[PDB]
């Protein structure tokens, strides 16, 4: 016999409340287990109020750094390495979230971007981007193309010119700098200059929207189809043959992507530390657990070694594991917060037609320093 058994799950995106409800109705069925499903809006202020107590439970679903990156420096239920024995999970999954020597991050949704291809009229990747032009001239020779996507989209131009030569820091064998910026370099310039000229060197107008620029590839099927926050799941599909491949390098190496794992859990495991972990292990990350979300509201898959055997059938994880195989974890870097304002005035203005990167770059070199 339990007591109260009440929990508050904060989620908001599209669905999930319907699936989580089924799990609660079954729990309370015993005689005292009801869960609440609400969307976050004022929790930002209630957090510091509920952190000490407030009510009782508290579990919100957020990105890796959003929760695991923030909670790590606040008050997260740092679990101990015990279940890892009977669980026999993978070290790469744990090492990915190893801060100091505790567990302040629980991933329960691996989502990432990738490139789609075919085995009929879609030539495979030659090697690097330099070859991309050869596929277009060849495709058009008949009645197709090898490039169709947005241009002024976020999290697209940044990662491209980010891992092209330089911008924030230099990566050497997987090592980032601290007080050493590399924005004032030929690499960072050659990149922004390439992605920018592509616009003025095309229609010098820029009349392609998100739904338009995206409709290009979605209009039929070209050598360029990337999935994102729009339609990851659709019950089922049929295109004869379809697969996923990793992005091609550029001037040495491709953009700088990362894994999209959702960090969910209790804060400091204050409210029921036992039931909290047990409820998450025996009512969230299990055959019956995910059975609700994986069926009710699908989107991705977990990183279970056992389930991975059958989960491999799905491309969702197959695409993430590709880049995640070698390494892909979004860092913290708080300086990025301020850069968000510079990246706009730098790109946006430069895209106006009466602005050059030399200004946003050179002028920034003086501001960034002093």
Swiss-Prot record:
| Gene Ontology MF terms in the entry | carbohydrate transmembrane transporter activity; maltose binding
What is its subcellular localisation?
Periplasm
Q: Name one GO biological process term.
A: maltodextrin transmembrane transport
The answer on whether this UniProt entry bears the keyword Transport reads yes
Q: Give UniProt keywords alphabetically.
A: Periplasm, Signal, Sugar transport, Transport
Recorded GO CC terms? ATP-binding cassette (ABC) transporter complex, substrate-binding subunit-containing; outer membrane-bounded periplasmic space
Pfam families this protein is in?
SBP_bac_1
Which SUPFAM superfamilies does the record associate with it?
Periplasmic binding protein-like II
For the keyword Signal, the answer is yes
Role noted for this protein: Part of the ABC transporter complex MalEFGK involved in maltose/maltodextrin import. Binds maltose and higher maltodextrins.
Instruction: Report quaternary structure and partners.
Output: The complex is composed of two ATP-binding proteins (MalK), two transmembrane proteins (MalG and MalF) and a solute-binding protein (MalE).
Q: Which family does it belong to?
A: Belongs to the bacterial solute-binding protein 1 family.
Q: What is this protein called?
A: Maltose/maltodextrin-binding periplasmic protein
Gene name of the record: malE
């Amino acid at each position: 016999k339990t007591e109260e058994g009440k929990l508050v799950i904060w989620i908001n995106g599209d669905k999930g409340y319907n699936g989580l409800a089924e799990v609660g109705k079954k729990f309370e069925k015993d005689t005292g287990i009801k869960v609440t499903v609400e969307h976050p809006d004022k929790l930002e202020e209630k957090f510091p109020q509920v952190a000490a107590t407030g009510d009782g439970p508290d579990i919100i679903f957020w990105a890796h750094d959003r929760f695991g990156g923030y909670a790590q420096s606040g008050l997260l239920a740092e679990i101990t390495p015990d279940k890892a024995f009977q669980d026999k999970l993978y070290p790469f999954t744990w090492d990915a979230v190893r801060y100091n020597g505790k567990l302040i991050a629980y991933p329960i949704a691996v989502e990432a971007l990738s490139l789609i291809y075919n085995k009929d009229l879609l030539p495979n990747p030659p090697k690097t981007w330099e070859e991309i032009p050869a596929l277009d001239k060849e495709l058009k020779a008949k009645g197709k193309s090898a490039l169709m996507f947005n241009l002024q989209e976020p999290y697209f131009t940044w990662p491209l010119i980010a891992a092209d030569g330089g911008y924030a820091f230099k990566y050497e064998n997987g090592k980032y700098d601290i007080k050493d910026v590399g924005v004032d370099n030929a690499g960072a310039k050659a990149g922004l200059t390439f992605l920018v000229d592509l616009i003025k060197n095309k229609h010098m107008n820029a009349d392609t929207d998100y739904s338009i620029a995206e409709a290009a590839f979605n209009k039929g099927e070209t050598a360029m189809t990337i999935n994102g926050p729009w339609a990851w799941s659709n019950i089922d599909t049929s295109k004869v043959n379809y697969g996923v491949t990793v992005l091609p390098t550029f001037k040495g190496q491709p953009s700088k992507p990362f894994v999209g794992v959702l960090s969910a859990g209790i804060n400091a495991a204050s409210p029921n530390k036992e039931l909290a972990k047990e409820f998450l292990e025996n009512y969230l990350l299990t055959d019956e657990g995910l059975e609700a979300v994986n069926k009710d509201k699908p989107l991705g898959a977990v990183a279970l070694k056992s389930y991975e055997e059958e989960l491999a059938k799905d491309p969702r994880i197959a695409a993430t594991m590709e880049n995640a195989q070698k390494g892909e974890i979004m860092p913290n870097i708080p300086q990025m917060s301020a850069f968000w304002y510079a990246v706009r005035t730098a790109v946006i203005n430069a895209a106006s037609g009466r602005q050059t990167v030399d200004e946003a770059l050179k002028d920034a070199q003086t501001r960034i320093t002093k």
